[PDB]
Amino acid sequence: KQLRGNIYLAKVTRVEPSLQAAFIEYGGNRHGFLAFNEIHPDYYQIPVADREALMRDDDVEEELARRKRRLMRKYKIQEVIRRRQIMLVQVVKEERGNKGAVLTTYLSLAGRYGVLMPNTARGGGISRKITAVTDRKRLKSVVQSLDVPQGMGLIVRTAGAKRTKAEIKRDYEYLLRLWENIRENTLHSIAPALIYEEED
């Protein structure tokens, strides 16, 4: 049983200020590892008017890179995360023997033609196999019209380059509903619970 891609509702078992990491009970054989920089600010224990002065930011992936680097300079994990806290976590790397799974709170949900990041203010854009100029200008126009919310991203994968006008809107819409489903499952779940299973 490979677990990569699965999403669990999970609980902080201990916070390790030397590693700037938290260890996570998510239902597996060993605790998962969650580096501080993989922890979405929604999970910070900070006043609501700090978490806002911070969502609005104080290869355009650098703007997001600088963003995370801002947080890591500004807080230490033990200032903002505590034992027993609950979070949604996704498996990034499989548990290998005695070593527990590597986790993130920056989720991604992969559809046929694209990947939704319901957690990453990244706006939506195109795979690095972005090559043939025609598709890339066309697709940028396509992902442009999607009106990707707020603090989400959508990345068009290569399966979508040679893809329908609206085969991509459908696929995107399916992922938005699946994100809704996930958030709804979490309100009816406790502690460690599998919330979404990486389908294929």
Numbering used by the authors: 36 to 93, 129 to 270
Task: Provide passages from the article that reported this PDB entry.
The protomer of EcNTD can be divided into large and small domains, which are connected by a pair of conserved CPxCxGxG motifs that co-ordinate a zinc ion. Within the large domain, four sub-domains can be further assigned based on function and similarity to homologous structural folds, namely RNase H, DNase I, S1 and 5′-sensor.
Furthermore, we have determined the crystal structure of a fragment of the C. crescentus RNase E catalytic domain encompassing the helicase-binding region, and show that a significant portion of the S1 insertion adopts an α-helical structure despite being predicted to be natively unstructured. The CcNTD1–575 construct was crystallized and x-ray diffraction data were collected to 2.1 Å resolution. The crystal unit cell was too small to accommodate a complete CcNTD1–575 protomer, suggesting that the protein had been proteolytically degraded prior to crystallization, leaving only a fragment of the full length CcNTD1–575 in the crystal. Residues 95–124 in this region could not be modelled, most likely due to conformational flexibility in agreement with predictions by PONDR and ANCHOR. Curiously, RhlB co-purified with the CcNTD1–274 fragment, indicating that the S1 and 5′-sensor domains of RNase E harbours the RhlB interaction site. Nonetheless, it is noteworthy that a helix from the S1 insert protrudes directly into the predicted RNA binding site of tetrameric CcNTD. From the crystal structure of CcNTD1–274 presented here it appears that the partially helical S1 insert occupies the area where RNA is bound in the E. coli RNase E structure. Negatively charged side-chains (specifically Asp 129, Glu 131 and Glu 132) could potentially mimic the negatively charged RNA substrate.
